[PDB]
């Protein structure tokens, strides 16, 4: 049965609630982004209206075969009316097509659902600036002070410099990047760009990336692995056995692999700067774990909430244990007391 934190009070709406069957008294189903924990349960047999971004709608049509008559894409940053309620979709700075949802209830309550997000000060100048928010449904994935990570920009700098150096030293090295869902495309695209290569991948993954509008994508990606020196593989194959096997498959075109595994967080961040990251090496295979996050760090989240000053916070992540929930509620109290709301 659908949890309370996926239900929007005073509406017939749910958010990211497709794995519960027919939710009682739900007239419109919103989807914040195309990740499996959120879309779990959509298919060609779905016949309720689905409201989402254009990119997320492209993916529903093409990857899940949801019928076009049930897909209701909305433009971003635009006041729209759904079943008589004013709504706005805002950029969530997560994966391609990911949104936050602003709801303007008939009685005057204003509700922000972040979906999955990485808070950024640029959000302090969207349609959020213009009015008060009574309730915030907050992505609390990394809601603890140990979660510190660098900007995406520093992480990409590190990756580009590392790959450029390795291939300059050895023109027969192959670079591999791991993936398991849309998101984090900049990692592999920035590397390919500095090396003067396209990124090679499976037909299925290429199809997925074509659904995303990215400009100049016919330009950066390909299914011809032979002509590419940046290959994309499933995250599961990013280990020494998987990569030795892949290397065998390339037919003596390459003699070394440098592989990247973009991860959310790893406790090396407690003791180490990005500059100081080193790989795991075995034979002619090196694996770098890099902290490329598409969720807010603790401090980024804190800042966003102390700016917004919501009257009530409802966590959507880490809600399954009493110790987690209690920990989060203690932080929310601190933030409020420090900011004076």
In the numeric block, which tokens belong to residue 20? 């519960």
Asked if 139 is part of the footprint of Ni ion (rule: CB under 5 A), the reply reads no
Query: CB nearest Ni ion: which residue?
Result: 116
Q: Residue 138 or 173: which CB sits closer to Ni ion?
A: 138
The residues in 202-261 that bind Ni ion, with binding defined as CB under 5 A, are none
Nearer residue to Ni ion within complex by CB, 246 or 295: 295
d(CA 72, CA 112): 20
Integer angstrom CA distances of residue 307 from 224, 304, 313: 48, 5, 13
Does residue 16 interact with Ni ion by CB under 5 A? no
Q: Is 122 helix (H, G, I), strand (E, B) or coil?
A: helix
Rounded CA separation 329/322 (Å): 11
**35 is a contact residue toward Ni ion (CB under 5 A):** yes
Other beta carbons within 10 angstroms of residue 161's beta carbon come to 11
Please say whether the beta carbons of 332 and 140 come within 8 A.
no
Specify the residue, 183 or 242, whose C-beta has the smaller distance to Ni ion. 183
With contacts defined by CB under 5 A, name the span among 8-16, 34-42, 312-320, 323-331 that binds Ni ion.
Answer: 34-42
Tokens of 340: 């004076």
| Choices 29-37, 144-152, 166-174, 268-276; region in contact with Ni ion by CB under 5 A | 29-37
Size of the site for Ni ion (CB under 5 A): 2
Comparison of 35 and 303: residue with beta carbon closer to Ni ion: 35
Q: How far apart (Å, rounded) are the C-alpha atoms in residues 105 and 84?
A: 9
- Identity of the residue, 35 or 246, whose beta carbon is nearer to Ni ion in the bound complex: 35
Nearest approach in angstroms of CB 116 to Ni ion is: 4
Q: Is 300 in the site for Ni ion (CB under 5 A)?
A: no
- Span near Ni ion by CB under 5 A; candidates 9-17, 116-124, 281-289, 324-332: 116-124
Provide the minimum distance between the beta carbon of 329 and Ni ion in the complex, in angstroms, as a whole number: 23
Q: In what side-by-side order are the strands of the sheet with 110-113?
A: 80-82, 85-91, 99-104, 110-113, 135-138, 312-315
DSSP 77: T
b/e per residue 179-202 (b: at least 16 CB within 10 A): beebbbbbbbbbbbbebebbbbbe
- 116 is an interface residue for Ni ion by CB under 5 A: yes
In contact, 121 and 303? CB cutoff 8 Å? yes
Choices 69-77, 114-122, 218-226, 297-305 (CB under 5 A): range interacting with Ni ion: 114-122
Nearer to Ni ion, 6 or 35 (CB): 35
Of residues 116 and 300, the one with the C-beta less far from Ni ion = 116
Q: How far is CA 105 from CA 80, 109, 129, in A?
A: 13, 5, 18
Q: In Å, how far from its chain's centre is CA 6?
A: 19
- Verify binding: residue 184, Ni ion, rule CB under 5 A: no
Which stretch, 27-35, 75-83, 101-109, 213-221, contacts Ni ion (CB under 5 A)? 27-35
Q: Which residues bind Ni ion (CB under 5 A)?
A: 35, 116
């Amino acid at each position: 049965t659908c949890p309370f934190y996926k239900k929007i009070p005073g509406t017939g709406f749910t958010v990211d609630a497709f794995q519960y069957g027919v939710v009682e008294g739900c007239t419109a189903y919103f989807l914040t982004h195309f990740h499996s924990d959120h879309y779990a349960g959509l298919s060609k047999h779905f016949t309720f209206p689905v409201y989402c971004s254009e990119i997320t709608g492209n993916l529903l049509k093409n990857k899940l075969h949801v019928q076009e008559q049930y897909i209701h894409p909305l433009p971003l940053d635009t006041e729209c009316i759904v079943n008589g309620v004013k709504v706005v979709l805002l950029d969530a700075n997560h994966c391609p097509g990911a949104v936050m949802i602003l709801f303007y209830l008939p009685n005057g309550t204003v509700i922000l659902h972040t979906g999955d997000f990485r808070a950024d000060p640029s959000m302090e100048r969207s349609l959020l600036a213009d009015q008060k928010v009574h309730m915030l449904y907050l992505d609390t994935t990394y809601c603890s002070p140990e979660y510190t990570f660098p900007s995406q920009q520093e992480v990409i700098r590190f990756a580009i410099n590392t790959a450029f150096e390795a291939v300059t030293l050895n023109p027969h090295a192959l670079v591999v990047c791991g993936t398991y869902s849309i998101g984090k495309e900049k990692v592999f695209l920035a590397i390919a760009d500095v090396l003067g290569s396209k990124v090679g991948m499976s037909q299925e993954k290429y199809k997925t990336l074509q659904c995303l509008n990215i400009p100049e994508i016919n330009s950066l990606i390909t299914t011809d692995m032979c002509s590419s020196l940046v290959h994309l593989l499933p995250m599961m194959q990013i280990n020494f056995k998987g990569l030795q096997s892949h290397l065998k498959k390339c037919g003596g075109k390459y003699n070394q692999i440098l592989a990247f595994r973009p991860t959310g967080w790893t406790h090396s961040n407690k003791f180490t700067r990005i500059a100081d990251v080193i790989p795991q090496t075995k034979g002619n295979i090196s694996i770098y774990g890099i902290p490329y996050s598409e969720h807010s760090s603790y401090l980024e989240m804190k800042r966003f909430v102390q700016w917004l000053k919501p009257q009530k916070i409802i966590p959507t992540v880490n809600v399954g244990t009493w110790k987690s929930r209690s920990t989060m509620e203690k932080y929310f109290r601190e933030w409020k007391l420090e900011a004076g709301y």
